[PDB]
A paper describes a structure:
Reconstructions of filaments formed with 2.5 mM AMPPNP, 10 mM ATP, 2 mM ADP-AlF4 and without nucleotide were subsequently obtained with resolutions of 3.87–4.06 Å. The low-twist structures (71°–81°) contain 14 bp of dsRNA in the asymmetric unit and density for nucleotide in the ATP-binding site. The 2.5-mM AMPPNP and 10-mM ATP structures have nucleotide densities of intermediate amplitude. (A–C) Density consistent with a nucleotide triphosphate molecule is visible in the low-twist structures with 2.5 mM AMPPNP (B) and 10 mM ATP (C), but only weak density is visible in the low-twist (74°) 1 mM AMPPNP structure (A) (red outline). Two out of six ATP-binding helicase motifs, motifs Q and I as defined by Jiang et al. (2011), are engaged with nucleotide in the low-twist semi-closed structures. Filaments formed with lower concentrations of the nonhydrolyzable ATP analog AMPPNP (1–2.5 mM) had a broad range of twists (71°–96°) and 15-bp footprints. Within these populations, the low-twist filaments had relatively high AMPPNP occupancy in the active site, but the filaments with intermediate and high twists had very little (if any) nucleotide in the active site. The low-twist structures correspond to the ATP-bound catalytic ground state, the intermediate-twist ADP-AlF4-bound structure is the transition state, and intermediate- and high-twist states represent nucleotide-free states.
Uninterrupted RNA duplexes longer than a few hundred base pairs are recognized in the cytosol by the innate immune receptor MDA5 (melanoma differentiation-associated gene-5; Kato et al., 2006, Kato et al., 2008). The cooperative assembly of MDA5 into ATP-sensitive filaments on dsRNA induces oligomerization of its tandem N-terminal caspase recruitment domains (CARDs) (Berke and Modis, 2012, Peisley et al., 2011). The helicase consists of two RecA-like domains, Hel1 and Hel2, and an insert domain, Hel2i, all of which form contacts with phosphate and ribose moieties of both RNA strands. The helicase and CTD, linked by a pair of α helices referred to as the pincer domain, form a closed ring around the RNA.
Author numbering: 307 to 474, 479 to 643, 668 to 949, 954 to 1020
The structure:
RNA sequence: CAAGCCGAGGAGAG
RNA sequence: CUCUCCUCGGCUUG
């Protein structure tokens, strides 16, 4: 391993105690300086006949294996014992034991917290911090309100104050936080920015920050920025299509007699639709809820029209209504006035909308703008042409990847592309899998795919190859994502683009984040130069406040919903105001999943085979006689006992009918019994 | 590989 | 404070 000049000075105080933060720019060899500090710490503790164990904490899964392979092991294999843990191994099981070996640990975080609370909650073996001598951390800036990793530090600080009260002593470990930039936490003033920085430092018990200042030219030579750049467009033609939908929506409303006091093709209208649907369901009146459920889809279509072709929205709707018709046919294998009206309204115009949509006279501006942007680069760079795109949603990524596959020009210049999204199981999309992710990464590094379409998945963690033409298509989250994307584009003649519309404040937000970036550095300078006694005073104050801010939160959130009422309810279908179950019939398996195993509920529903699995069905999706999907099948002990949700059902209390929607099971107070085969058997 | 439970953070709009 | 979008982590059934 090698020791750079400017990494030296930033590392220097850490080498003799002095828990600190380190914020350097991106790509400056953050991991490597980490590694060096490790080796020093361990060699030191050996030379003093003192036990030395380091643990690394990360926030994602992949970074653990990542760093295990590339940085720590290749250099420290010979002197020491290393290991890499995560939720994707089998070494989680005896975590207290691996500590008894493996002086170097890498780990996903919540592993640790789980073990601590097992030591402090059950009679399990567990572990305490005393068994360490260092904690190295990545991505400092997640240390905020009740994240994971702040439990850890709140406990560290609790024990530190125990030590301090003792002094007026357990040897606490050293801490070393590493980041790119800690970031201003939503503050409108330089002073509150400062306050936030100090809040971080108190949550890390730091002594400084140690930005690089002295050996700065070596950085500028070795490391450089891209060039910021904007591209803007405007649209007032909306020629055939938009109005063609607004007509429909207006017709539905004037069938429903509901006044939005709002506009078509925005987000407040959506919120209204939601609460209206919820109200209609808590009351039970159809004709309003179901129309709302459709209007939401129409609004979504319009929103994506603002960014994406008409064809994609038409397809979105086609999928929706095709599904609904298939549902009604599987059930009927009756036709209420509502659904009949809605379908008759839609399908008559289906062919029209298909014609209107395919119309290259007025496709979209931003797509053309990025056409120009992209072609410029891939003509300039010629086979060293790595690319990245960022957007907001998943569907957008699929659409763009599809298009770039379709249009010939992109394929002509060698614009090989692939999409990328996150693995969360929610949000009406089939997510990806970690394997797919890693493979795409390796293809990019290989060069199979020249450019990637991504959500916010890329602006952290996983290690993409350096790039040229990072852009930004309808997304401005905050300064952190801004800088982290800004730190990708090496390979000179790099850029950082933003593509937006005119009448949607985004460039606004871009500038705000730019100012925030310029602000935080000022604050850093304010604090680095702060006097040590004053600094100490303030961090002590903040640590106290943080710990007291814990206790209170503890005193008001013990249970907050504890009234266990077994069968005091009735679950109805939310589309059709129809009984489905009572609370007694339901049971739980593994104290997590809810399920019912009475033949009454058995006969009520229908199974529609899966589309996720065709991409032999195993987990069937349940539907009603109305058509409302309810749940999913399940295989427990071979019993195909069908699970369900509480997002599609409505509750009715027996007393006075405040019917409520809950969106998940933990929110409600009442408890359900565990499953046992004594019922239905013996 | 599919299904689901819980928790956390960020952003928008209200 | 609520809704939506986005990401992440831990954990179970198969
Ligand atoms: N001290 C060093 N000496 C030699 N090469 C280094 C050093 N630090 C980093 N590198 C090289 O830089 C690459 C890895 O470092 P880097 O690009 O900073 O990844 P990183 O630690 O993830 N930076 P970041 O993305 O900001 O977290 C490899 O090509 C290394 O060879
Ligand atoms: Zn129904």
């Amino acid at each position: 391993l090698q020791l750079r000049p400017y990494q030296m000075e930033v590392a220097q105080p850490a080498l003799d105690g002095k828990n600190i933060i380190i914020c350097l720019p991106t790509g400056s060899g953050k991991t490597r300086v980490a590694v060096y500090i490790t080796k020093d710490h361990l060699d030191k503790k050996k030379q003093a006949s003192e036990s030395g164990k380091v643990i690394v904490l990360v926030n994602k899964v992949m970074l653990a294996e990542q760093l295990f392979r590339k940085e720590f092991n290749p250099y420290l294999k010979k002197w020491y014992r290393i290991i890499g843990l995560s939720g994707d191994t089998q070494l989680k099981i005896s975590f207290p034991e691996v500590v008894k070996s493996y002086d170097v640990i890498i780990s996903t975080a919540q592993i640790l917290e789980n073990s601590l609370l097992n030591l402090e909650s059950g009679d399990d073996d567990g572990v305490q911090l005393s068994d360490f001598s260092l904690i190295i951390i990545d991505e400092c800036h997640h240390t905020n309100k009740e994240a994971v990793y702040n439990n850890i530090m709140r406990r560290y600080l609790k024990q530190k104050l125990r030590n301090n009260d003792l002094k007026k002593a357990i040897p606490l470990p050293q801490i070393l936080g590493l980041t790119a930039s800690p970031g201003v936490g939503a503050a409108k003033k330089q002073s509150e920015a400062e306050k936030h920085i100090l809040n971080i430092c108190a949550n890390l018990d730091a002594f400084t920050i140690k930005t690089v200042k002295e050996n700065l030219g070596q950085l500028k030579h070795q490391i450089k920025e891209p060039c910021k750049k904007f591209v803007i467009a405007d649209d007032t033609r909306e020629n055939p299509f938009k109005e063609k939908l607004l007509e429909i929506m207006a017709s539905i409303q004037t069938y429903c007699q509901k006044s939005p006091m709002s506009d078509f093709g925005t987000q407040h209208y959506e919120q209204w639709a939601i609460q209206m649907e919820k109200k209609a369901a808590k009351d039970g009146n159809r004709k309003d809820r179901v129309c709302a459920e459709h209007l939401r889809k129409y609004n979504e279509a319009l929103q994506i029209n603002d960014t994406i072709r008409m064809i994609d929205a038409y397809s979105h709707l086609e999928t929706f209504y095709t599904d609904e018709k298939e549902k009604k046919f599987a059930v009927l294998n009756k036709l209420d006035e509502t659904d009949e009206f809605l379908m008759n309204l839609f399908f008559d115009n289906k062919k029209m909308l298909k014609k209107l949509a395919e119309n290259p006279k007025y496709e979209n501006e931003k797509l053309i703008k990025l056409r120009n942007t992209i072609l410029e680069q891939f003509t300039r760079s010629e086979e060293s042409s790595r690319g990245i795109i960022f957007t907001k949603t998943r569907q957008s990524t699929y659409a763009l990847s599809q298009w770039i596959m379709e249009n010939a020009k992109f394929a002509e210049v060698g614009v090989k592309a692939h999409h990328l999204i996150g693995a969360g199981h929610s949000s009406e999309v089939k997510p990806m899998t970690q394997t797919e992710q890693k493979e795409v990464i390796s293809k990019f590094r290989t060069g199979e795919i020249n450019l990637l379409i991504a959500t916010t998945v890329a602006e952290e963690g996983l290690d993409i190859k350096e790039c040229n033409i990072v852009i930004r298509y309808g997304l401005v989250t905050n300064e952190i994502a801004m800088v982290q994307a800004r730190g990708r584009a090496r390979a000179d003649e790099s850029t950082y683009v933003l593509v937006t519309s005119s009448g949607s404040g985004v460039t606004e937000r871009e500038i705000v984040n730019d100012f925030r970036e310029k602000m935080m550095y000022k604050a850093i300078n304010r604090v680095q130069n702060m006097k040590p006694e004053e600094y100490a005073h303030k961090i002590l104050e903040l640590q106290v406040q943080s710990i007291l801010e814990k206790k209170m939160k503890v005193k008001r959130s013990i249970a907050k919903q504890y009234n266990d009422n077994p069968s005091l309810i009735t679950l109805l279908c939310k589309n059709c105001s129809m009984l489905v179950c009572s609370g007694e019939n339901i049971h739980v398996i593994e104290k997590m999943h809810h399920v019912n195993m009475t033949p009454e509920f058995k006969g009520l529903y229908i199974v529609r085979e899966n589309k996720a699995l065709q991409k032999y069905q195993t987990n069937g999706e349940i539907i009603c006689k109305c058509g409302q999907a309810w749940g999913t099948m399940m295989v427990h002990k071979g019993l195909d006992l069908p699970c369900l949700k509480i997002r599609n059902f409505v509750v009715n209390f027996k007393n006075n009918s405040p019917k409520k929607q809950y969106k998940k099971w933990v929110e409600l107070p009442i408890r359900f019994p565990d499953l046992d085969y004594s019922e239905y058997c013996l």
